[PDB]
Structures are given as C-alpha cells and as structure tokens.
Write a protein that binds this DNA or RNA. Structure first.
Lengths: 100, 134, 124, 328
RNA sequence: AGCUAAAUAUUGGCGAGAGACCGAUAGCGAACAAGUAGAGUGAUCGAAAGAUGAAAAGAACUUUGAAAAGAGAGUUAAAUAGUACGUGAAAUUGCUGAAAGGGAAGCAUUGGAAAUCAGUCUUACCUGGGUGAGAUCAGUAGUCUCUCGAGACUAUGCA
RNA sequence: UUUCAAUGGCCCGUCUUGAAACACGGACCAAGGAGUCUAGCAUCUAUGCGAGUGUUUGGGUGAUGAAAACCCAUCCGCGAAGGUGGGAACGCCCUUGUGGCGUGCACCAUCGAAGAGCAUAGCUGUUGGGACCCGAAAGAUGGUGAACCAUCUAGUAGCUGGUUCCUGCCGAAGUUUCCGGAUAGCAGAAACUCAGAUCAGUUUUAUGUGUAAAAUGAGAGUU
RNA sequence: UUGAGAAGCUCAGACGAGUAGGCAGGCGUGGAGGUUUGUGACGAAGCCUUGGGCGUGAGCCUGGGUCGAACAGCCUCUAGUGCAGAUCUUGGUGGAAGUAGC
RNA sequence: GCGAAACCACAGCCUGGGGAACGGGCCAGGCAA
RNA sequence: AAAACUUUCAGCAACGGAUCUCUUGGCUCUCGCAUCGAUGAAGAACGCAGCGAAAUGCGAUACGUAAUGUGAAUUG
C-alpha cells in the first residue's frame, strides 16, 4: 500500500514470511517527490507482483499526490474561518435582547 | 436446484470451491459427480464401512492393483473383521479407529484435496457410496 | 448513466388521508373486497418490483453522488479514492467542533460534503 | 499442515531469549467461525437468572393479565456435547495465534513483537500492578489497555438502571500456569483478563462469538498446551481419550490447490473472464445496406430488372378460349 | 410399646447478595397519604396520584383592582423551567394572515399560477523564463532503530 | 406546498352472498392490546462423535461473580442382534469418433437366500398442558346481613367478534370415487432415469365410432 | 483491463393477474456478549416543520426550530417486538349545545 | 345566571334508468346563488 | 363575487399529558439464620410533639429515659 506520513508518501509492503511478527510486518520505503521517479520506484520494488497489485498502488500514489496538492493550494488562499454556533449562547442572547 | 451446500463447515465451502473450478474446467464426469455429492445432505451421505470398501476393491477377480477408493462421507471401521487389506482411501472424514486401522496395516488415508492434486480428472479411482436405506 | 427515477411521488397508504390514526407509511391493503387493492381506475398505485431504478443508479443523489455517512474525521479519510462517486454525509449528532474538522479535511481531500453548512458560521 | 515450528520467549526486560518452544499441535486445529458461534451462543446462556411475573396477577384490560404470563420454568440453560465444546475451544485457541484474526477483532497489536506472544515464568511471580504495566509497555501490548480505557462509555438504554452501568472493550488475555501473584498483579488493569491454562473459557477466547482474542501466554502455560489439548494422533494427558479434531482438508489454502501445476496442467483452455456483447442491437438487413452485405454475399451483383420484352411478343390466346370467354 | 441426628421442603418470619426482569396505563392493588381515601347495614370491595432548578435565587418594589388577579419590575444559563412547574406529541379550541367557498367534501393524473427550497461556478492543467529558496539532491560529513541499506533526524553547501 | 383547470374514482373492516344486496362494527386522538411458555412425538436440515453415543443425579474443582467455566467415577438410556442383467464412476483401447472390451457404486430388476445410530441446536407438523385473544346460565365450598360476598376457577364454546411491518416466487381446489371419513385429483417438496424416451382435452393414415400405425409439437416418465 | 466480497464480476433469452395456501429475502422496536481506539453541554434522546435527499417498499439519512443528558451503526444472542378496527381496556377531547333545560 | 344526556363512517335537491339495493354517492339530466 | 358564515393550509396562544431520559418502587432467582403469647402476643382504641396536614415515632418516664459510644449539630 501507499500511504502518506507527514507530507511524504511512503510505500508500505508486507510479505507472507513476516506475517507472524506484527512489529516487523510492514516494510516501508520512501517515495520521491518527482512523480516520474516515484513510479519507477514502485515497479522496481513491486516487481513480479501481480499487475493488479501494482495497479492499485499507482492509483493510490496518484490519488495521494492530488490530496497533497490540494492541501497546499488551500493553505495559500486566505480561506474563511468557520466559527461555530452555540445553542445556549444563542438562546440566552435571544431572550436578553427581547427584554432590552 | 442444488447449487450451494446447506452446510456451514467453512472447510466444506473451500472443498466445494476447489471442485466447482475442477468440474467446470475439466471434461471428466468424476468431478461433476463429486461436486454434486458435496451438496448432498448429511442424510443422503451414508457412512461407508471399511469392510464394505475392503470387499469392493477386492471383489470377484480382485486385482486391486493400486486404485484409490473415493467416497464423500465418513468411513467408519468394522471391528467384526480382523485383517484389513492395503487401501488408499479419500473421504471427507474418517473415524480415529478406522484411520488408524488403514494406516497401521497397509496404505494411507487421504482427504478430498489430496486426491484432487493426484487425480484431478478422477484417474483410476473407484467412487463408492454407502447403503442409503439405513 | 444519468440519475433517472421511475417515479418521484411517494407511495401513501390507502385512506391514510381521511384518518389520522392511520399512518402514511405504506401498508398493503389485505381487504377481501378491497377494490383499491383490486387495481381499479381512479384508485392509487401500489409498490411493485417493476418500480425499481437502474442498478447502476440506485442510491444516487440527483447530482450523481451516493451519500456516505461519516461519523468522525476518520470516516472522511477513507473516501479519498471514491470522491467522484460518494459524498460525505455528516451525521446529525456530530458536534459543531468536529463538524469543522470534517469539512476542512474533506475540502482538501477533494471529496464533496453534503451538509457542510450546518450549525457553523463563516467569518472573514 | 506446515507452519512456524518454533516460538520465541520474551523476558521481563522485553529482549528475546535464545530458548524456544515448538508450536503446539492445538495451534493447527480447524478454525470454525460457525461452530464457535453456535457454541458460544449456547454456553453464554448458562449464567442466566430467571424472571417472571406474579402468578396471582384480560391482556387488553388495564390492570390485567398480560397474554402468556412469563414463567420461571422457561429453558434458561442449553446443553452442548463436550466434544462440541472442546472443538469450539481448540478452534478458539488456534485462532488466537493468527495475527489477522486478532486485528480483525479490534485488538491493537500492531506493534506486538510476535504472535503467539509468550513470556517467561518470571511473570507469574509479579506482585505489583506497576510491574505488569512495566512489562506490558516493553512488549508494546499496552496499546490494548490504552484502547480499553478510552472505550469506557455509559451503557445505552435501560441496562444501566440494572447494575449494568458501564461498557468497554476486551483487552489482552494472560494465560498463566501457577498463581504466585500474577492474578493480583494484572487484574486491576482495565480489560486484562487472567485465566488458567487448564480452565480456558470460550467466553474469554471467543468473546461475542468472534474468534481471535489477543492472548499473552507464559512459558509454563505454553508448554502445558501439548498436554491439555493433545494432538491429532496422541491424546491429551489431562483430558481423557480426547484427540484434536481432524479436518475435511489438509491444505486449507484453496488458491494454492487450484493454481497449482498438478491441476493447471490438466484443465482445458480458459475462456475470457468477461465475454464481449455480441449482437448488442438488431439492425434490419433490408433497411441497412451494410448488414445486407453481411448476410447476402450476393446483393453486390443482382441487377433485378431485366428486359424480357420488345422481341416480337407472341400474342398467345386460343380462339376457342376467346369464344368461351365472350359468351353469355 | 418408645425415642433418635444429617442428607430433604420452604409463595411466611430475620437479614443478605444479584438479575440478557418491569420502567409510572408497566412492574405489586400500592415508586407518593396504599389496603390509603372512598363504596357498601354487613361480610367484603378499593382506587387516582413520580420529575421547577445547580441553588428558592419561589418574583422585593411600583401600580390597577373590594379582592382574586393583571401590568410594569426582578431572579435565572434559560421563566420556550413561575410551584396548573422536565420534554410538552395527537385529538380538540380561540386569534391572526392566506387563498378558496351554486346541495358536500374527499383523493389521483397532467400542468399552470402564487408562495418557497433544491446548487450553482475558470480553474485548474500544461508549458516558458527569471528571482530567492529546500533535500527524498550533495564527484559530501554524524547519531538513532531496524535489516550492506530501509527509515527518523542533526550539521553543512543549494550545484 | 395551497389552489384551480380538464379527466376521473359509490365507505372502510368483518360477515353475508358466485357476486353484490346486505346486516353489522366505526364520534375523534394517544397509549395498552392478542400462535406465546413448556413436556411428548415424528420430519427436514446443521454440528460433534460414529458400533457406538450422551460431562451438568452427583463428585472433583473454580482466589480476578464462584449460580459460569473446566475435569470424570459407578451406573444407566438409546443402538448394536451368492449368481444374472440394467445401471454411477473409471481404465484399456481404436476406426480413433462411433463404440467395444472390461471393472461395476446407490439401487432396481431378476434367480435368491460385511450394521448407522446416539446427542445437541434449529425449522415445520402434531398431541397435551389455562394454550392465539375476547365473550354461555354456572355449579360447588365457605361466609354476610330469598338476597349478597369471597375462593375453588385459567369450569365449560363446534359458536361470536378480533388476531398488528414490506417486497419476490410458485398458486390451486372449489369434487370425482367409494364412503362423518379414508381415496383420488389439483398444487407443490424431495429422491430417482432417462431426450438414442416417451408423450399430447393433437391431427392424420388405415384396419374393423373404436382400434392400430404418419405429421405437428414438447424431453418424458416414475417413487 | 486491473471485473477474486467465486457469497464476486460478467453474458444471453423468455417471463411478470391472484384468493386459500406453500417458499424466500428483508425493514423496524426493547434488551444481551463482541465491535466502531463511535456520537454527545461547541447539545444525546425526543418533538414539531410546505427544508433537502435515499429505498419498489417496510423504512432511512440529513437541514431548521424547540430541547437538555444521554445515544447509536455493524456481527451475532434474545423476546412481554410492529395495529385502524375486537358494541376492545384506560385517559383525553368534540359535534350534538348554550340544546334539553333549571 | 346556572347548565345535560342520547346520538354520531361520512354526508344530505330530486328525475329516471341503472340488471345485484342501487340512492346516499354511478352515468344521463335538470337544478344548483 | 367581499363581510358574516362554511372550508382547507400556515403562524400564535390555549387544551391535553403521549413521547423521550430516569427511578430511595415492583417482580424473579439464589444465599444465611431460627426469634411471639398468662412475665399478657397479634390486633384495636385513646392519648402524646415548643407547631405538624398525613406519616412515622412514643406511652403520663409519651415523636421516648438509662447505659455504651461517636463527638457539635436539629433545622420549616
């Protein structure tokens, strides 16, 4: 699988021969920022794996990058805050006003 | 009609999964027959005794050679007969008394999965059934 | 494959309009001489399997997305790879605190939130 | 059935030890989610108390006798054959060694060094619950206890009005062999249940009916597993005449059975996984000229109209035929 | 002719622990003044009735009214909690606004009209250069956990 | 959403009746409200074991509810007391295919004379038990001042009224025949054997309207 | 070509009345063991509302208003579990009616 | 001024025909303010 | 045709007390124990508080005294 950890997409892999040791089960490697080099990394690491399995990892790497991109652009723009609404202060101010 | 077992033995839903593939991807009638009988109820699968199997392989002209008897169902023993002959048997289940008696004096016992990897097409196998009347 | 429905109007119970003890939930009329059960003219319709919608369109909102109920912010993360077909419905009891955490996370994830403007208020 | 011959014993400090134990025969027994369910289903009705109404006290009348007065002689306890109970519990023990069925039950064992998790006999001599937390945090099993602590909600509904106030998950299970202070060490740790090897309980190895409770064996308890359950050939010394179940199949991995050479070398050809749609539409041979060529490899050369006249047409009519035609 | 422990019973009495039990039309007839009021010459029969709020802070005071009460005003997080007190549903009734209203109404289809909500989004992508950067990059130097190299970092330069 | 315009639509449930006609029950709203609990029997399915089978009378035991779990001694219950052909499956082929040669399960024909249960759980059925819910004067015992009260009592019913959510599939019979019934039939549900085999609210051909042997169709027959 | 919840995916054709009755899959309520490292004073449950949706349907999800302390999705266990009727029980409330009338 | 009970599916122009009453609802009609 | 009256829908106020939440109550099972009276019991009546409406408590030593404790509250 491909899942991000603090702004960096890592490739997590497990094998049958490490399935009985939960601590050391998931070998992890780091995928580079260059998208073209990222895909060469997946193939040279997921090689001779089923084409289905390498297919799903590339999609996730694609779909995770678009997440990281969107997280960046939203930070750049000065998007509005979302100050919530309280049902107790709204009521108390509604009653105190009417009396005023 | 019957195309899904009523059972919930999870390993019988793996045995059927093996013989659903074999039945539809080979031209043998042994597989199409085996798959059908993996669907049958517990009532329709009678126990087949060891002595009845021993008589069938060593029947008339004998000449047992090394044919493998295959039955879907248990294979209970028969203490009423002392000398069991050499037998290769495949079945869903054995009884600990029977399986020891086959193993101790003669050949070996097999499950339906070990027969398939040896004779996927039913190659030189006797497919028997127990007495249904009961 | 567009979102097309075989019927808009709901199925109301027969005579549910006349009475108030009679609920509008559809109940099959089992009356032996019931002419409305007998499918006469001027009567009401009745649910049939013939009214089912396209199996590639069942559960689909008019904009093509299927509603998906996210309780917390963990749930909004797993819609990372189905954002083009599912829309993160926010549960009704999720507080305004976590409600913003769900909407801000879902905005960057790329998924569509259906009730993103509930109990909250923007500030510039 | 070939799997993982040896397991490694972890000391108090958390470091592995050079000693090892052969994986007990019980840890290969069949895993049966249906059989554990229909046994836990029964065995869980065995600590029930009877309830009823006052026999002295129709159904529709206010202050009336409700239909069918609840009667204390209802069936409260359900019988299961012992060999069904041992099978459901040998299966329950087998499924506690498979890490997947532990995560899939909700156990936070993503950092546990090894499954089945075995410690040495020094854990049985603990005295203080600081020590158990000391050990748990060096085996990285404390994630389970920190999960259960955060999961301590208040019950939903009229249960909490009935001495059933709180709810929470189930933590790790510590299976010991001798009581010398382990039972009073770990017990206050939320969720952590301690049960002896010789009296393993299905409500504690298959809670909720679901297989795969996280068990933390000890070395003395693990070594007794070969004697409390037995083997498929020998017999448990402690359970008389009891042999572990024998399965329907040996190799439970079907995809290996099917995708092996010994089968894939004899199957006939392979069809497509999805067959393309042939004749999706019906095109009229008359209306469409291209479909006509598909069906009529003659329509290219017809020349239907032919001049069979303007060649001195021999007017043919019998004179007597005309006479009988123009009569009466 | 006679006695005699323990093993056994237990809708009562003295206490105790629990429950996949009922949750105020239920569970006892009784969650409270419950065999209580009340009914019956009598024997007997026999109910209805739980919840302001954290705290009473239970509404001073002014005013109108014979009072009862009302209006100001106060307390409170809130009086859409004011002792007719938790939430306050339906039936049902009054006021207002709306449209409609030749012995019914009623609903169903199709619209129209009035009234009102559904939801809006060019914006990003790609490419070009410059400018400063950083690092998963150094013809680079160290530590940590793993299994040479795979991670997390700490310097240092930004090719 | 309200309203209007055009087209429409006899009050619902029960019971009755082919059908209605009906006669009933319905002022309105909320809440309560009726196949349940249990022992026995048989069936189907699931599971464990299998010539066996069943720990829970009881004993051992259970430090973290200890009425759970776990373990087994002596009984006991229920079981246990040969050829011929057609045949499932397989092999050998070999003019291959076609078929033959075989080996022949379950079983059926024939001639004849190599045990399959036990236990648990479910489903449906049936018999009892207050027995789906409601409704018939009671009667008896014992009391109170012909009357009245309390219990036995969940006394009695072929009858009356009612019996509660959705969709999908199949779907009769509505009556022969003997005689309140056993049959049958229709519908299913299972197990079988065959389409190279039989059939048909069929039609012809022809022999003497019946019978027997061509077309038109459909796979047909059993338990 | 990624389409192995093999209980999946895919392809083709015909078909669709229904009482008695037979079979199957589901929806909903109270509580029970497991679970969601679930929701909740930044508002649970409930309630109303011509707000928006989902399902053939039983039903479900959500917005707003009230509200104030609990609750739920999923897998199984379980039962005092689903109402329009019973001249049904209990409570409430109308027309009749400001009528009979006093 | 003090104030019920009974009753209540819902209503209420007929004309005819509407086969089984049909008029209290259906169709032709008039009426319908 | 507007008003009046009749009708539907919405707002608001009454009316009603369902729903939801709980709960010093009920029911059910298990467990331990052995204890009334002529030395006046059970029951009943009349009394009694700095004031009690019921309600408990108490007996002219009356909402109790002695004694052993606890150690500063009763509480409208």
């Amino acid at each position: 699988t491909v899942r991000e950890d603090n702004g960096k997409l890592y490739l997590y892999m497990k094998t049958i021969e490490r399935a009985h040791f939960p601590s050391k089960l998931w070998q992890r490697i780091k995928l580079s920022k260059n998208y073209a080099k990222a895909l060469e990394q997946i193939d040279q690491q997921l090689l001779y794996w089923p084409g289905r399995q390498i297919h799903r990892c590339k999609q996730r790497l694609t779909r995770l990058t678009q997440y990281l991109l969107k997280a960046r652009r939203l930070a750049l723009k000065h998007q509005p805050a979302l100050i919530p609404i309280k049902p107790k202060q709204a009521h108390r101010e509604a009653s105190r006003e009417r009396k005023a | 009609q019957r195309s899904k077992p009523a059972s919930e033995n999870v390993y019988l839903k793996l045995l059927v999964k093996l013989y659903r593939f074999l039945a539809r991807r080979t031209d043998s009638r042994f597989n199409k027959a085996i798959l059908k009988r993996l669907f049958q109820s517990k009532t329709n699968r009678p126990p087949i005794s060891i002595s009845k199997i021993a008589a069938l392989t060593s029947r008339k002209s004998a000449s047992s050679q090394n044919k493998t008897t295959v039955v879907v169902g248990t294979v209970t023993d028969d203490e009423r007969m002392l000398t069991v002959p050499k037998l290769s048997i495949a079945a869903l289940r054995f009884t600990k008394s029977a399986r020891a008696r086959i193993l101790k004096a003669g050949g070996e016992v097999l499950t339906l999965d070990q027969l398939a990897l040896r004779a996927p097409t039913g190659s030189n196998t006797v497919l028997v059934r127990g007495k249904k009347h009961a | 494959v567009n979102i097309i429905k075989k019927r808009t109007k709901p199925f109301k119970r027969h005579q549910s309009d006349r009475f108030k003890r009679v609920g509008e939930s559809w109940r099959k009329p089992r009356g032996i001489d019931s002419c409305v059960r007998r499918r006469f003219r001027g009567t009401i319709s009745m649910p049939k399997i013939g009214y089912g919608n396209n199996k590639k369109t069942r559960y689909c909102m008019p904009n093509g997305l299927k509603a998906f109920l996210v309780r917390n912010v963990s749930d909004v993360e797993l819609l990372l790879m189905h954002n083009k077909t599912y829309a993160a419905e926010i549960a009704g009891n999720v507080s305004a605190r976590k409600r913003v955490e769900i909407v801000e996370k879902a905005r960057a994830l790329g998924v569509k939130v259906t009730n993103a403007g509930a109990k909250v208020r923007s500030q510039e | 059935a070939a799997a993982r011959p040896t397991v490694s014993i972890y000391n108090k400090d958390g470091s592995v030890s050079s000693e090892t134990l052969a994986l007990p025969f019980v840890f290969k027994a069949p895993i049966r989610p249906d059989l554990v369910r229909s046994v836990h289903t029964a065995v869980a009705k065995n600590k029930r108390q009877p309830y009823a109404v006052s026999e002295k006290a129709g159904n529709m009348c206010r202050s009336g006798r409700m239909f069918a007065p609840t009667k204390t002689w209802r069936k409260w306890h359900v019988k299961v054959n012992q060999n069904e109970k041992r099978y459901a519990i040998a299966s329950a023990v087998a499924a506690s060694g498979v890490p997947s069925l532990l995560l899939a039950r909700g156990h936070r064992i993503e950092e546990i060094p090894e499954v089945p998790l075995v410690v040495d006999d020094a854990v049985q001599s603990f005295q203080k619950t600081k020590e158990a937390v000391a050990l748990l945090k060096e085996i990285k099993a404390y994630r389970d206890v920190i999960k259960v602590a955060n999961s301590r909600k208040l019950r939903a509904g009229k249960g909490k009005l009935r001495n059933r106030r709180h709810v929470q998950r189930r933590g790790p299970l510590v299976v010991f062999n001798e009581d010398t202070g382990i039972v009073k060490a770990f017990r206050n740790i939320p969720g952590v249940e301690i049960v002896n090897v010789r009296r393993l309980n299905l409500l504690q190895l298959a809670p909720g009916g679901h297989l795969g409770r996280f068990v933390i064996w000890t070395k003395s308890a693990f070594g007794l597993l070969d004697s409390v359950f037995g083997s498929t050939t020998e017999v448990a010394q402690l359970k008389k005449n009891y042999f572990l179940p024998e399965n329907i199949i040996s190799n439970a991995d079907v995809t290996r059975l099917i995708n092996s050479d010994e089968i894939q070398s004899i199957v006939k050809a392979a069809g497509p996984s999805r067959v393309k749609r042939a004749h999706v539409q019906k095109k009229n041979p008359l209306k469409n000229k291209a479909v006509l060529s598909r069906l009529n490899p003659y329509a290219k050369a017809y020349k239907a109209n032919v001049k069979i006249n303007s060649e001195k047409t021999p007017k043919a009519a019998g004179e007597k035929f005309l006479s009988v035609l123009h009569e009466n």
